[PDB]
């Protein structure tokens, strides 16, 4: 009460604005009759449905 | 998936010129065989001639030789096999058969994975 003591706690919900380097994920479509788009889908892991 | 289209055949006077053709979808015909295969009723699938990938060579069997020609096109993805001076012993049902194999051999041409339906040709009278 009269006194408090420091506590640390890991894991907190706290954010700061920051940049860094995202990473692709397309429809899978199983890369099958694509001939051979531009975009090519098969250089980045596919997505979740 | 590899899937082969036949198109052209019929009938045919004896003494003339016919032109099938084979388009090949799910693969580009530059790095694999394409063979012709051909068979005849009463008897097993024979064998008539393929076009390997090395070098664009081509190979045809002892019975036809001057007489048929294998040619492919990789920009339209189509394989040609142009007969000249027809016989009544070819009138038989022809296939192009494939096995994604850079290299062929003309006694493996019969048993092969893939195969089209194939077209029908006569010659008579």
């Known amino acids: 009460a009269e006194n408090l003591w420091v506590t640390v706690y890991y894991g907190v919900p706290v954010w700061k604005d920051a940049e860094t380097t995202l990473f692709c994920a397309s429809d899978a479509k199983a890369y099958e009759t694509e001939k051979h788009n531009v975009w090519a889908t098969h250089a980045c892991v596919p997505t979740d449905p | 998936q590899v899937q082969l289209q036949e198109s052209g055949g019929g009938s045919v006077q004896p003494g003339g010129s016919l032109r099938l053709s084979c388009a090949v979808s799910?693969?580009?015909?530059?790095?694999?065989?394409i063979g012709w295969i051909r068979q005849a009723p009463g008897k097993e699938r024979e064998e008539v001639g393929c076009?390997?990938?090395?070098?664009?060579?081509?190979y045809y069997v002892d019975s036809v030789k001057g007489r048929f020609t294998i040619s492919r096109v990789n920009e339209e993805n189509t394989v040609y096999l142009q007969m000249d001076n027809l016989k009544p012993e070819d009138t038989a049902t022809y296939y192009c058969?494939?096995?994604?194999?850079?290299?062929?051999?003309?006694?493996?041409?019969?048993?092969?994975?893939?195969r089209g339906q194939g077209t029908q040709v006569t010659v008579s009278s």
């Open positions: 058969v494939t096995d994604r194999q850079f290299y062929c051999a003309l006694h493996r041409l019969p048993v092969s994975q893939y």
């Open positions: 799910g693969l580009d015909v530059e790095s694999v065989t």
């Open positions: 076009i390997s990938g090395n070098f664009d060579q081509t």
